[PDB]
Design a protein around this ligand. Structure first.
Ligand SMILES: O=C(CC(c1ccc(F)cc1)c1ccc(F)cc1)Nc1cccc(F)c1CC[C@H]1CNCCN1S(=O)(=O)c1ccccc1
Ligand SMILES: [Cl-]
Ligand SMILES: [Cl-]
Ligand SMILES: [Cl-]
Ligand SMILES: [Cl-]
Lengths: 99, 99
């Protein structure tokens, strides 16, 4: 699809068999989701935002659907204000910025 | 143009007679620029997200040139780690997400 930016580009994602809302964010290097249970081992990661740095849990090769487009990749879990789909997954679904 | 998301979508902008590098950020509602002088009245505002909040100065009706496209809108000025072009100005240059 083609998504304008007059409102937040919020889309439905499916992760761990559950539907959630997430923001398509070109300004985010990685994907970060609110607290949830994910399988496997996690690795430590620090991400920086507008107000400073936060610690998150990094899970790899996680299956996730974004607006019905299938992706498998790195998902970070931590104290994020909203679920954010960053460039790591936007590139997987072939998302581009156009003007 | 068509901007892919393999790397950070950094562009050159012209604001208040200065050239700056800024990130095209669909996840940001507002445009936030590092400390600089802007003309006119301003009001304080708090903006937040990953890492918490920061205090900024809100200037209205500011002209910005993004990739040669002229846009007018509110610009927040404060201690941001990166200059951000948010949705309030991305809509003005007719920027869309496509996949
Ligand atoms: O990719 C990064 C680092 C990045 C950055 C971007 C913006 C920013 F404000 C702070 C850092 C960066 C760092 C240094 C540099 F020179 C160029 C870019 N961050 C990261 C990684 C995974 C996930 C993730 F969410 C984030 C944060 C994304 C940002 C920007 N898009 C909106 C959501 N946020 S926010 O800080 O919450 C925010 C909220 C309201 C207004 C403005 C920013
Ligand atoms: Cl959707
Ligand atoms: Cl990934
Ligand atoms: Cl505005
Ligand atoms: Cl439009």
């Amino acid at each position: 699809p083609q998504i304008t930016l007059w409102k937040r580009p919020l889309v439905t994602i499916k992760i761990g068999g559950q539907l959630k809302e997430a923001l398509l964010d070109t300004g985010a290097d990685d994907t970060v989701i609110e607290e949830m249970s994910l399988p496997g081992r996690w690795k430590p990661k620090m991400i920086g935002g507008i107000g400073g740095f936060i610690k998150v849990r990094q899970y790899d090769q996680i299956i996730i659907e974004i607006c019905g487009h299938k992706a498998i990749g790195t998902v970070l879990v931590g104290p994020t204000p909203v679920n954010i789909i960053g460039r790591n997954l936007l590139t997987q679904i072939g998302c581009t910025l156009n003007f």
